[PDB]
Chain length 125, copies 2
């Protein structure tokens, strides 16, 4: 069902995985989903949460958001792609505020906490 | 401001322009925004509105939906990209039933009207 999202995440680069999980973590499973799926991700906190030097953190998010934006998750039947979907449909780079804005697709934002719960369950150490 | 959608609607190929127009019809001024953002387009109903060799209508609709999906509406500031966005975030290929389903981005719907405007602003006959 939603395992596909979990499948697709395996194929993402390290920082892309981070970006998505970091966004997930900013969601409150108890309350409603973010308006239109918008979530802001600051470099400093990203750089702290993972072990990165904040001095270059923004560059990292920039590249990461851009790679995510370019992802194309597809479904096939035989050799033909039958369905195409994006993780995000909108990205705002804000080097001034040191953050990036991500608009997660309608069909995506509802599975983010599910992803978060999954990554947590394999967090052994 | 939202004059970038018209300025970007230039980049689309004729069919793409048609897709965005066709999917701009199935909306009302009385009634609010569509059913979420999804609009189904039939290859038959396509040749009817635009006159096409109904024999290859679907394949056209396909190529067009794919290209629209690959467009990158982006803005520049001082030569660097500062914002990226997609016309659509989801596509379903239902060749078996001669049609494609298109998920229009939340940032695109509030303009499928203002867009439909200008498009007829070039009609003379
Ligand atoms: Hg985070
Ligand atoms: Hg977490
Ligand atoms: Hg910010
Ligand atoms: Hg979903
Ligand atoms: Hg139409
Ligand atoms: Hg129209
Ligand atoms: Hg159909
Ligand atoms: Hg808009």
């Amino acid at each position: 069902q939603s395992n596909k999202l979990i499948e697709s995440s395996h194929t993402l680069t390290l920082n892309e995985k981070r970006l998505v999980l970091c966004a997930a973590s900013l969601i409150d499973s108890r309350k409603p989903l973010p308006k239109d799926g918008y979530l802001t991700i600051r470099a400093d906190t990203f750089a702290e949460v993972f072990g990165i030097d904040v001095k270059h953190a923004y560059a990292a998010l920039d590249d990461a958001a851009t790679k995510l934006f370019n992802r194309d998750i597809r479904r096939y039947v035989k050799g033909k792609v039958v369905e195409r979907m994006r993780w995000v449909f909108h990205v705002k780079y804000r080097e001034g505020q040191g953050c990036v804005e991500l608009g997660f697709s309608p069909t995506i934002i509802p599975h983010l906490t599910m992803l978060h719960k999954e990554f947590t369950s394999y967090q052994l150490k």
